[PDB]
């Protein structure tokens, strides 16, 4: 993580190459001589380095130019271009800084932003940072959206986002400096406890886990190598793939057994044939011997023919006695082999049922992470964002993640309790129609040059529509909304007085009895300072548990919590909360997932802004007016906070370039 090159990495950029974005604004340079480029990248990389090893304060053009070493001093316009570009696309001077020069006296251009989720807030600041007139409209009575922290007395628990998934390349790294977030690592040890209340044997746990991981790899091979991605011209889910793979293992378990017992009977039958030869030879002997005895009984003197008979019979007998021994030799070899085949029987089962249950927990954990049943995930594409995951440990925000939006919302024009109802856009400009949430009859109307839609994918999906577009959105947009997946995942908050669990253990699981209900309270979290345990509802279960009352749900928890710990040690909870993210109408779910039939390409569609038709037919091509951000716009960081943020920053760039022009493409 060393040098200016580290700033490139910490800003998700290749230190040694020019991005395609950069090509667009600096086509002269990238088209130009190698040397000129090498320069460019340093100027870039260096400037970044400056911003981020102190992101508490604005970085001006002069302040940057200040740290200039030849030949990088030589060109002053180049440095200015770079700094401007970086500033525009929120690579520096984003989030919460101390400004050097207070804002320009006068504003330019008017933008309405829908929603004060992180995506919204991020862009709002940026735009206002570029001196546009900005106003956000939130249906809620609070900022943050799907960042939602619960607070009562010293109890502080997050119902929404809770984890910073590494800092290596994460924008939130920079935000962590700007805001006080209490970042605490997570101890990976997760003990499992079957229905009985008894931990799973360490030997078991390890095997099933290892099997689970293999079963995944399996599907990936299954997908990419065997190209098994369509079935009945319907796209294949991850769940289907798993089922298939499992069967094939279950099947191959049998195939082994068969082939083993068939090896036995092949030998068992060779023996049968021997034993006959043996039994018949024994008879020829019995009877021959008899003859020899009789011939021997003839007392001498005797002529030579009678002598010969004894000898011939004697020899004929020792001959037959040789054969039989060669056979009893052969017999002993086959007989020992039989017992060795019998000694090492191929395995009886693939997995038991007590196993299949524990496996179903590892699946529930997967349905948890992606907030959806595996039957819905695209086999080909679900893990497409895996290549861009950050580096370093995953941390919780201990003081409540709400700290971050709230921080961001300082000095921003935010109309809470204002539910947008309709969005009209035309060549001339656009108008947005909201209402008060409290008296739905009271009506508001806003006019602006541009609209930024950070409406959640669930909202956008709604049918019939919670928000109406005039004119309606292009089919290419709406199809993408249909194809994309919007999952669900729910948390249960348990406030006790006494710590009755192991405090050195952060998280522990509980193994549901059935496949069907593997999601129910399948995992628990002591991650907070207070005496506070969270319990997760994932998979199919999440959607269904949203019709069971709080009381019942806490019932089920406590019950679960007495197995493991005993009815003495488990008190009633003082305060409890249950979330209902899919029922929550300013969300309609938790976050996106690449549903089967979609690809990451749909994420790019949802970011494409929209340009209205011209006003007077054969008038010039208009300016685009309606833009989109949010967790579902960012192909490489979907369904996270950092992605939401990044999407905001991004649009703020796109918009300002439109309405203030780009003086950095010279």
């Amino acid at each position: 993580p060393s040098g200016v090159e580290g700033a490139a990495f910490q800003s998700r950029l290749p230190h040694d190459r020019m991005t395609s974005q950069e090509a667009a604004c600096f086509p002269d340079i990238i088209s130009g001589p190698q040397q000129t480029q090498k320069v460019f990248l340093f100027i870039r990389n260096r400037t970044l380095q400056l911003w981020l090893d102190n992101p508490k304060i604005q970085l001006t053009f002069e302040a940057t130019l200040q740290q200039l070493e030849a030949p990088y001093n030589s060109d002053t316009v180049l440095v200015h271009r770079v700094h401007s570009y970086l500033e525009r696309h929120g690579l520096i001077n984003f989030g919460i800084y101390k400004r050097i020069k207070p804002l320009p006296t006068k504003k330019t251009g008017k933008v309405i932003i829908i929603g004060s989720g992180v995506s919204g807030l991020a862009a709002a600041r940026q735009l206002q940072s570029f001196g546009m007139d900005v106003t956000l409209l939130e249906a809620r009575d609070r900022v943050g959206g799907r960042v939602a922290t619960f607070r009562k007395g010293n109890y502080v628990a997050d119902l929404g986002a809770m984890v910073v998934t590494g800092l290596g390349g994460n924008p939130m790294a920079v935000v962590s400096k700007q805001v006080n977030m209490e970042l605490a690592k997570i101890k990976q040890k997760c003990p499992l406890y079957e229905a009985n209340g008894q931990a799973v044997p360490k030997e078991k746990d390890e095997m099933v886990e290892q099997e689970f991981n293999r079963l995944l790899e399996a599907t990936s091979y299954l997908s990419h190598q065997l190209d098994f991605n369509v079935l009945n011209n319907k796209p294949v889910s991850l769940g289907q793939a798993l089922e298939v793979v499992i069967q094939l293992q279950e099947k191959h378990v049998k195939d082994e057994q068969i082939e083993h017992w068939k090896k036995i009977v092949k030998t068992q039958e060779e023996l049968k044939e021997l034993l006959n030869k043996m039994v018949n030879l024994k008879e020829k002997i019995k009877e021959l011997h008899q003859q020899y005895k009789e011939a021997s009984e003839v007392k001498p003197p005797r002529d030579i023919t009678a002598e010969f008979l004894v000898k011939s019979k004697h020899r004929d007998l020792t001959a037959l006695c040789k054969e039989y021994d060669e056979l009893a030799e052969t017999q002993g070899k086959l007989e020992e082999k039989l017992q060795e085949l019998e000694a090492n029987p191929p395995s009886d089962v693939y997995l038991s049922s007590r196993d299949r249950q524990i496996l179903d927990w590892h699946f529930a954990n997967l349905e948890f992470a992606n907030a959806t049943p595996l039957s819905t995930l695209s086999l080909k594409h679900w893990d497409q964002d895996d290549d861009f995951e950050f580096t370093g440990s995953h941390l919780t925000v201990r003081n409540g993640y709400s700290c971050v939006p709230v921080a961001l919302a300082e000095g921003l024009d935010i109309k809470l309790n204002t539910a947008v109802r309709q969005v009209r856009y035309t060549a001339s400009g656009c108008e947005v129609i909201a209402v008060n949430t409290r008296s739905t009859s009271q009506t508001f109307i806003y006019k602006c040059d541009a609209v930024l839609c950070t409406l959640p994918l669930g909202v956008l999906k709604q049918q019939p529509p919670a928000v109406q577009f005039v004119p309606p959105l292009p089919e290419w947009k709406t199809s993408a909304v249909q194809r994309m997946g919007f999952g669900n995942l729910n948390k249960v908050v348990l406030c006790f007085d006494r710590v009755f669990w192991d405090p050195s253990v952060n998280l522990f699981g509980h193994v549901g009895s059935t496949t069907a209900s593997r999601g129910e309270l399948f995992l628990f979290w002591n991650l907070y300072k207070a005496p506070i345990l969270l319990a997760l509802v994932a998979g199919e279960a999440a959607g269904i548990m949203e019709n069971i009352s709080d009381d019942v749900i806490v019932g089920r928890c406590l019950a679960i919590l007495k197995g493991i710990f005993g009815s003495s040690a488990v008190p009633q909870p003082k305060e409890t909360v249950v979330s209902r993210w899919r029922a929550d109408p300013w969300a309609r779910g938790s976050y996106s997932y690449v549903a089967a039939g979609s690809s990451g390409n749909d994420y790019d569609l949802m970011a494409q802004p929209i340009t209205p038709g011209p006003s007077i037919p054969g008038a010039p091509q208009p300016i685009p007016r309606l833009f989109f951000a949010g967790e579902h716009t960012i192909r490489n960081y979907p369904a996270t906070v950092h992605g939401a943020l990044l999407s905001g920053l991004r649009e703020a760039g796109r918009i300002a370039d439109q309405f203030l022009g780009a003086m950095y493409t010279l």
């Binding site: 293999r214 079963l215 790899e217 399996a218 091979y221 299954l222 190598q225 065997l226 098994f228 079935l231 089922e243 298939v244 793979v245 069967q247 094939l248 293992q249 279950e250 099947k251 191959h252 049998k254 195939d255 057994q257 068969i258 017992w261 068939k262 036995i264 009977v265 068992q268 039958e269 023996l271 049968k272 034993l275 006959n276 043996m278 039994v279 024994k282 002997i285 019995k286 021959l288 011997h289 020899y292 030579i304 023919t305 002598e307 010969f308 000898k311 011939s312 004697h314 020899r315 007998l317 020792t318 001959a319 006695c321 039989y324 009893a328």
Partner: protein, 133 residues
């Protein structure tokens, strides 16, 4: 290029559990019933070969004949001359069996007998008689 360790999935046998919605349980039940089959067949031959073992009980110790050690001699007494002719007649050309039945001649001694005496005992003729068998 290859599946994980101890995970088995050829192209062919994927397609085989795909065709219908119950190839799953079909293919699996075929083998379930194909297995019970081979197991009952095993039991049969255990009982069948167990009864054949009972009949071999005793080995062949009752019908065993003491060993004797004869010191190959060079001379042919009239006695073992006559044993030869008869041995040839019965055993034809089984030089071994003949060397055994006489007892005190080697397998080569038998060979050169055939030639040395071919004349005096019409051995050619004798073999023709054994031929007709």
């Amino acid at each position: 290029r290859k599946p994980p360790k101890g995970m088995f999935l050829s192209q062919e046998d994927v397609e085989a559990v795909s065709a219908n919605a119950t190839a799953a349980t079909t293919v699996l039940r075929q083998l379930d019933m194909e297995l019970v089959s081979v197991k009952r067949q095993i039991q049969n031959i255990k009982q069948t070969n167990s009864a054949l073992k009972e009949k071999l009980d005793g080995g062949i110790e009752p019908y065993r004949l003491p060993e004797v050690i004869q010191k190959c001699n060079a001379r042919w007494t009239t006695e073992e001359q006559l044993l030869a002719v008869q041995a040839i007649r019965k055993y034809g050309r089984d030089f071994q069996a003949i060397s055994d039945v006489i007892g005190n001649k080697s397998v080569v001694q038998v060979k050169n007998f055939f030639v040395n005496y071919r004349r005096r005992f019409n051995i050619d003729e004798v073999l023709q008689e054994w031929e007709a068998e």
